[PDB]
Design a protein around this ligand. Sequence first.
Ligand code: A1CLS
Length: 166
Amino acid sequence: NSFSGYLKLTDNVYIKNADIVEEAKKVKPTVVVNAANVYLKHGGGVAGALNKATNNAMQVESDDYIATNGPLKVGGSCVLSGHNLAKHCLHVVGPNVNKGEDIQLLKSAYENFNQHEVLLAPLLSAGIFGADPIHSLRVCVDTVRTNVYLAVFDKNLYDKLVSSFL
Ligand SMILES: O=C(O)[C@@H]1CCC[C@@H]1c1ccc2cnccc2c1
């Protein structure tokens, strides 16, 4: 495949210090993962950045999805368009520790990735979702079996994740 510059962590997990918006524009992957909430309100973090890169088209599509189907479950996902970034966007809801949600749902959230052979993704529940990114990477490695290319925006966090990886 065309992903370049990644550190191989395991047989199927790869990681890079990169802005997932810029990576998606360069690679045009089959699937880019959004760190969504149950309402698909793409305000900040990964979701706000991906949505802004689509000129708000992701939000317009998402509002129609919710009007038809109602909210997602914490730990659940839906497949929508990837717009100008990817063929598809897999919107995955990891638990938000800053809203008091159960971190055990993080494994269920990563299981959605197994429905796709290859994905470009952020660490679920990390960043503004409040979980420990080292824990998120561990759950990713121990749950996802398909090929996942993780983009970590912050260089300092990337270096901490590599240097602490078991
Ligand atoms: O990758 C990271 O550094 C952390 C870990 C979970 C996602 C979070 C993050 C932070 C800033 C971001 C800016 N722009 C886009 C995506 C972004 C994602």
